[PDB]
Amino acid sequence: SEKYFVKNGQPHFLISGEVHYFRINPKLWRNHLQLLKQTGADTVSTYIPWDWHEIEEDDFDFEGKTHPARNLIRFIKLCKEENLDLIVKPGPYILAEYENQGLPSWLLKKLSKNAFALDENGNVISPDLVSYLSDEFLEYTFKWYDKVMPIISKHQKEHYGPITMMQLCNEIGVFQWLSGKSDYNPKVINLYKEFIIQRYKTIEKLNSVYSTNYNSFDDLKAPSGKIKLRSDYCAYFDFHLFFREYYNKYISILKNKIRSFGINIKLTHNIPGWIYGNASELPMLISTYSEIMKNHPDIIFGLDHIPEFVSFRNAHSDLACNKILEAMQPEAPVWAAEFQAGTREHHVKAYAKDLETFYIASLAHGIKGFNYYMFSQGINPEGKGFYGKTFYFQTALDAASNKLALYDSIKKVNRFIRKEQKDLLRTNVNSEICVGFYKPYFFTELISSQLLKEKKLNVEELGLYIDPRFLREEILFNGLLRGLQTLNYNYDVVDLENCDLKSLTAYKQLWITSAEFMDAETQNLLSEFVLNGGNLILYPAVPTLDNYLNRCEILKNNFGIEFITKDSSHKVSAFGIEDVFTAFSKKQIYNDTNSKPIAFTQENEICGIRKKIGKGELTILGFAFGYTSDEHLELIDKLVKLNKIKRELFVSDKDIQFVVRENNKSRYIFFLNYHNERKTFNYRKSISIAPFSYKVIKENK
Amino acid sequence: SEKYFVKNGQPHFLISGEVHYFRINPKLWRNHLQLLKQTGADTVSTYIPWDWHEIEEDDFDFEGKTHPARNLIRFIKLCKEENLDLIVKPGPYILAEYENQGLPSWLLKKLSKNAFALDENGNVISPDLVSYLSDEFLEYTFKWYDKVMPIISKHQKEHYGPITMMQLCNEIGVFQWLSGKSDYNPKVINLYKEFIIQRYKTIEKLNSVYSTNYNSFDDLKAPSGKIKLRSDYCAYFDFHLFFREYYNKYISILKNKIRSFGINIKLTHNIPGWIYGNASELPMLISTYSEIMKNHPDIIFGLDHIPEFVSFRNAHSDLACNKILEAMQPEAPVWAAEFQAGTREHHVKAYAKDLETFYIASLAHGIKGFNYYMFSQGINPEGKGFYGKTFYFQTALDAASNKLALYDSIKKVNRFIRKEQKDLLRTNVNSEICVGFYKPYFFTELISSQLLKEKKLNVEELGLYIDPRFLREEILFNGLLRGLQTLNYNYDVVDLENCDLKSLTAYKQLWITSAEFMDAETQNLLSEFVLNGGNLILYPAVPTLDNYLNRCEILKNNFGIEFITKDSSHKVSAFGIEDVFTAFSKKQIYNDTNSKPIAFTQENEICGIRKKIGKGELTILGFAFGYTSDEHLELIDKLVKLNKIKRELFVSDKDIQFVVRENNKSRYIFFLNYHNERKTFNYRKSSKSEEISIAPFSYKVIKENK
Ligand SMILES: OC[C@H]1O[C@@H](O[C@@H]2[C@@H](O)[C@H](O)[C@@H](CO)O[C@@H]2O)[C@H](O)[C@@H](O)[C@@H]1O
Ligand SMILES: OC[C@H]1O[C@@H](O[C@@H]2[C@@H](O)[C@H](O)[C@@H](CO)O[C@H]2O)[C@H](O)[C@@H](O)[C@@H]1O
Ligand SMILES: [Ca+2]
Ligand SMILES: [Ca+2]
Ligand SMILES: [Ca+2]
Structure with missing residues (x-):
């Protein structure tokens, strides 16, 4: 049942350490590799920076002819001699706090205007930010692949070489995220137009969904500016779907080019989203990869975990992230492609005693492999460093291979893992609670995010009151998931898209955090779930709209629910718990015919009910609670106990x-x-x- | 030389504990007071909630006639019997995680729309958020004061009662700040118009400052929407000056009303700004009190410290806040009106082992008194909790008066303070470094802040590149102040407004974190400082504009500086430190005339120089660094060592x-x-080493x- 890496036909915990040969005195390459192997690590991981090896246009040095640390060939040989497997990451983007994010200075200087990502005004967002599907950019990327991929092909595990995995690029879309700015490059806008025509076929069909009044597809423009109208919301929702296809197109072009060199090893990609030591936005970023994950079962996504500290303040972030990756990639092990070791930023300390706990918590929370990032500190060569001379601090090894405090913590955790991995990798938790992952609520990186600082989404302007980012961040991530983990109740997350009814029926309770909108397929799935004997907990709203905010009341009508939305005090009573704080004045007040009322407003109106439907049970709460009081833990606890679910x-x-x-x-x-x-x-x-x-x-x- | 509280003509450490009588079984009031006294605390502190005592309109209970915990009179009497002095805080606002921030439900239901804070469009920002100078709001507040103030007057220390201090309202502007929207109530609009007419006298004079073409004062309104032109920046700057006068009017009105009841005790106010365990926005909020602090020597401001944890992530917040209060209130002791004890919210833990360290660090960082908030947990009566039934967690005492873990931490700290207060209160650190506090950089709560919903200030739209909020958060608070504390270099902060040259010349170095703008008065002060023998460190810009973004080149000319602003790599070298990361591509490029070049761009252009000017020394760096790398600490250390300043x-x-x-x-x-x-x-x-x-x-x- 469990997914895990395998070595010598046994369950193998992937223990990798990131060691940037290009940032290390090559005289000490062997010392770093020996000290990494001596922790019980089996694998070493590195970027192969395009900028570092194509020193000028069509001048390649992988042999250290021009600088000893360009001797990639010798670094591969040292991995084999020290019996470490190798993860290689040739980009084109590497980020890695490397000047121009790994793109050659000569390339960026030479590229046309519209090789770059453009804002609505047709201006360059960043002098190091290309448009992924720029013909110029793919031309040069391909010419780089033409030189580095034969080396990787020769040394791949499929040729009994040390290279077991390759990452394609780095954190696709991470710059659309960090700036909130979408690429308006005319190439991208043309592809978006093709995407829309393909999706709707006629302008009448699109007009029918958007309530627009286009005479043809020729009058259709990429959405921009704040959302004022439901038609704007619709155009932006399809713009989100388009960017998921766009990223799949980008990673498909890279993968096809890579396969043409006969590279048949495992391909990887890495998920960003931690900032300031929490990951409440990581689910939005993983949602941007939804089309890649459904179309490429041979690309393993791993997490980039950056907790910075280990406390009740962020305890829930790594479990919620692991569980969501499991939801979206159930056929591959959950693993951290970047697993915090030391700190990227001097002023943000990373304590050995913190990270040691994080490593053990990560095993508790179902991790099956990781790459310590950064195992070895680096020194940026000749002004290649974005932020300073030194790359990372408080690592296992400094850039000169001196052991630091973290070394002994990693050795202790690795010794535990090696002793247990055969049994531990085949263990699971017993989850009787399932929590639904409704991806469309996450599809907002262009209109609403923690990093986008001017919000384009204001749901009040659309006649709505439940914002999907507030819902997914405060009610779901920091609310329900944080509360179940605190209460020590096992949960699993399930992706509701194309979801098998049979994968819901194993659970004693399915929890759905619902806004006012939800597509017909998901409304249908949840109706069927309860009718066939499932127990559904749903809040804060019975949905009444689809993803385009058009009437859809399938779940409401199937469950015999009637409600009025009414203003009341923030506090309700629920299952005899008084002074439950709720996020909204507006609540659903339910007709209680054939229902048991279990929640009440301050004026004793019914804002939650329980009901039987077919063979199943329904609990609906017309109010939004997170975890900001002891009453919230009591309420979550009472809800779990409705179906007699016990802690282990x-x-x-x-x-x-x-x-x-x-x-x-x-x-x-x-x-x-x-x-x-x-x-x-x-x-x-x-x-x-x-x-x-x-x-x-x-x-x- | 130190400022501290006095009792019996001796140094006395003010130790108070917050105990909310209205959230505690009154049969247990005495046990709470006795246990607080037994920690060595001398004072107890409480809100007197309007909502709690004006139970219906014109129906008052201070005697427990309708609920025993309404017996304020009995609580006051017990404070006296248990030999605790009493701080009273009757609002009208208390916040205190109390329903409607302590205002009566009947009041908020009765008030007309014009009693409330309104947005740009005239909609109510929040149903519990009043406009401070609302006629209706101040009428009801006065009727509340008419009943509560006679009780406070009768029980003052001068009538042998226990009451020694009273707080006026609670964290003025905190509710506006947290709503993320500023007040455009018609009282604000009309008082602003009167302010502008008084300030400019003629529309011609306003037009010459703003570069506008108004025909009359009737064409001018309170600025709304984003800053697109320099004239919009000017309008907002005057709007910031106005809000400081507005907050001074509010507290003056409350204070005058209170004094009429024969209340002669010490009056206090409390400073908001901590959020998520850091205080980088507190200096903005304290800046909104600038006019209160210059007009009311008799109102003592104290800090509300909410660290939530104690680590390098937030180590620098309490010291910087204490130093900034001292700069703005140099003639009163630095003290915490609210000094975190337990946690206001269940999901944010407050560990005894963190807070005990916070308490000691606060002594290290110059604190002279505090009020443990909350010493005692409470249980909200009658659904009065904003957020749930329980008021605070992990306090010194639970609501029942059982000792929790924190009790022993507080008794240990207080024991050290009582043993040492006569010496410790008279101690100072040896600060050879002064950092300038230029308040106008803080005047952005209407246009740019961590909490404001709309970002109204985009300096690039005005042809500027140095954002005053970016400068004061990342270059000063999280940058210079953090780096100096991390490097264990003592610093003082001095308010540059009406600043005495004599109060700058005791330092080996004055550090000024400058934007492109600075008023003529401050440019002249820093010029005179250096000419007369001062050592000035100035970065990231020689300013060339005044506060209205009009030409002012006084400092540039007095220091004989020529520069061009040019684009380059973020990385510079400074004092032989390579790959110093800087915030901006644009840098000031100086010529080397009569100066030593000490910093270079990646194209080897001069972005820093060192010069002798009259009897003084000037170091100018044409680039912005905070503390985001080891190079930044190395640079701060090099600059300090230019004048041979040494760690103790x-x-x-x-x-x-x-x-x-x-x-x-x-x-x-x-x-x-x-x-x-x-x-x-x-x-x-x-000036053998201990382990x-x-x-x-x-x-x-x-x-x-x-
Ligand atoms: O910067 C460290 C390391 O992380 C990866 O990118 C980071 C990302 O995970 C994170 O969410 C954001 C915001 O905190 O910062 C970075 O993008 C990246 O793949 C590595 O190259 C970086 O070295
Ligand atoms: O909430 C705890 C106590 O704190 C004061 O107000 C805080 C303010 O200091 C802080 O900056 C903001 C954001 O964290 O929250 C406010 O609640 C109040 O004066 C107390 O009444 C309150 O109980
Ligand atoms: Ca699992
Ligand atoms: Ca019905
Ligand atoms: Ca001092």
Whole structure:
């Protein structure tokens, strides 16, 4: 049932360390590789920077002819000699705080206007930001691939070489995210037009969905500016769908070019979204890869985890991210392509004692492999560093291969992993709770995000009150997921798109965090789920619209629900819990015919009900609660207990987090203390831990 | 020389604890007061909530006639019986996680639309957010004061009562700030018009400053929408000056009303600004009080500190805030009106082990008094909680008066303070570094802030490149102030407005973080400082404009500086430090006339020089650095060492923070470990080395006699 990497036909925990040969004294390459191997790491990972090896147009140096640290060939040879497998990442983009994000200075100087990503005004967003499908950019990218890919092909594991995986580019779309600015390059706008014609066929069909009044597709312009009209929302929603196709087109062109060199090893991509030590926006970024993941089962996505610290302040971020990657990529192991080791920024400390706990928490939270980023600090050669001379701090090794505090933490965690990996990789948690992942709520990187600082989406202007980013960030990520993890209830996440009814029926409860909009297919799926005997918890709204904000009341009508939206005090009572704070004045007030009222406004109007439908059960709450009070934990706890769902353990201290992982033979109990407090507690089936620390217990069943 | 509270003509450390009588079973009031007293606290502090005591319109209960916890009179009497002095805070606003911020439900339902803060379009911003100078709001506030102030007057210290201090309202502007929208109520509009007429006298004079073409004052309105022209910036700048006069009018009106009841006690106000455990926006909010602090010597401002954790991520916030309060209020002690105890919200933990370190660091960082907020947990009666039933968590006492973990941390800190207060209160740090506080860079709460919904200020639209908010957050607060604290260099902050040359000349260095604009008065002061023998460090720009973005080249001319602004790589070299990352592509390029070039762009153009001017020294850097790399700390250290300023101690671990406080008699060494690492290090005084071992997120205090 579990997905995991395999070596010598056994479950293998992928332990990789990032070591940038191009940033290290080549005399010490062997020393770095030996010290990495001595931690029990099996793999080393590196960029192969285009800028570093194509020193001038059509002048390539992979042999150190012009600088010893250009000797990629010798670095590959050293990986083989020190019996490390190799992950290679030749771009074209690498980011990696490298000048021009890894693009050659000569290329950027020489490219035309509209090789670059453009704002609505036709101006360059950034002198290092190309348009992915620029003919110029792909021409030069292909010429780079023409030189680096034969080297990679020769040394690939399919030729019994050390190279086991290759990453395509780096964090596709990360610059549309960081600037909020969409590419308006005329090439992209033309592709968007083709995308729309293909999707709707006639202007009458599009007009019918958008309520527009185009005489033809010729009158259709890429959406820009703030959303004032539902037609604007519609045009931006399809612009989001278009960018998912665009990115799939980009990664497909790179992959096809790569396969033409006979490279048959595993291809990878890496997911950004952590900032300031939380990952509440990472689900938006992973949503941008929805078309890649459905069209390329041979590309393994890994997470870029940057927790910065390890506390109750961010404990939920890594589990929610792991669970969502599992939802969107169920046929491949959950792993971290970049797994924080040291810190990218001197002023943001990364403590060994923090990261050691993060590493163990990551095993509790289902991680199956990782690449310590950065294992080895680097020194940027001759002004190639974006931000300073030094690349990372507080790593396992400094750029001269001196051991730092993190080295012993990584050695201890790696020794645990190697001792347990055969059993641990085949364990899962027992989730009786499923939480729905409705991807369209996440499709907002161009109109609403933590990094886009002028919001184009204001749902009040559209006659709506539930903003999908507020819903997915505060009610879902920091709310329900944080609350279940705090309460030590196992959950799984499931992608609701093309979702199999049979993959929902194994769970005792399905939780759906719903805005006022939800497509007919998902409304139908949830109707069928309850009618066939599923238990659905739904809030804060029964949806009444589809993704284009056109009437769709399938779930509402199938469940016999009637409501009026009414203003009341922020606080409600729910299951006898008084003073439950809710996010909105506006609440759904439900007709209670054939229903049990279980929630009430301050004026005793019914804002939640329970009902039987066919063989199933429905709980609807017409109000939005996150986790900002003890009442929120009580409410989540009462809801879970409606279907008699039990924690795996009774633990005397409710502030201790635990994860029970088991298979037929083995149990691991992970205890995690996310608090600045020495805690002593006891447990039993349904010990002292230092601050910010952990304890792992094994049971034979 | 130090400013501190006094009792019996001796230095006295103000130790208060917040205990909300209205959220505690009144049978347990005495037990809460006795346990607070037993920590060595001398004072107890509470809100008197309007909503709680005016139960219906013109129906008042201060005696527990309708609910026993309405017996304010009894709570006051118990404070006296238990030998605690009492701070009272009767609003009208209290916030305090209380429904409607403490205003009565009946009031908010009765008030007409013009009582409320309104947006650009005339819509109510929030149903609990009044316009401060609303006739209706101030009428109801006066009727609330008519009933609560006689009780406070009768129980003052001068009538042998326990009441020693009273807070006026609560964090003026905090509610506007958190809503993300500014007040365009018609009272604001009309008072603004009167302000502009009084300020400019004629439309010709306004037009000459703004470069506008208005025919009359009737064509001019309070600015709304984004800043597109310099004239819009000018309109908003005057709007910022107006809001400071507006907040002074509000507090003057409350204060005058209070004094009429024969209330002679110390009046206080409390400063907001911490959010998510840092305080980089607090200097903006304290800046909104500039006119209150210059007109009311008798109102003492205290800080509301909410660190949430104690680590390198936020180590610099409390020191910078304490230093900025001192700069704006130099004649009163630095103190915390709200000093985090427990957590206001269940999902944000407050660990006793963090807060104990915060309390010690606060002593290191010059705090002279505080009010533990919250000392006692409460339970909201009758659904009065804004957010839930329970008021605070992980406090010193639970609502029942059981001791929690934090109680022992507070007793330990207070014991040290009571043993040491007579010396410790009279100690200072030796600050050879002064940092300039230029308040107009902070005047952006209407146009640019972390909380404002609309970004109205885009300086590139005005032909500028140095954003005043970017400068004051990243170059000063998170940059220079953070770097100096991290490097263990003592600094003072001095307000440059009406600043005495004599109060700058005691320092070895004055550091000025400058934008492209600076008023004539400040340009002239810094010019005279250097000519008379001062050592000035100025970056990232020689200013060439005044506060209205009109030509002002006083400093540039007095310092004999020629420059051109040119684009280059973000990286510069400075004092032989390569690959110093800087915020902007645009840099000032100086010619080398009568100067030593000390910084170069990637094309080897001069972006920094060192010069002698009269008897003084000038170092100017034509580029912007905060603290985002090791090069930044190296550069700050090099600049400080230009005038041979030395740390008080050699410490073997650069990541240990220390403060040395001394007087005549005593030296205190504070060691602060803001890191999740057990650290074993040695130190010595910089004028045989002692070895110290310190836990994660911990502290050591050494006292020496002499
Ligand atoms: O910067 C570190 C490392 O991270 C990867 O990109 C980061 C991304 O994960 C993150 O969400 C954002 C915002 O915090 O910063 C970076 O984009 C990247 O693949 C690596 O090259 C970087 O070295
Ligand atoms: O919320 C806790 C207490 O804090 C004060 O107001 C804070 C303010 O200091 C802070 O900057 C903002 C954002 O974090 O939140 C406000 O609540 C109040 O004066 C107290 O009444 C309140 O209980
Ligand atoms: Ca799993
Ligand atoms: Ca019905
Ligand atoms: Ca001082």
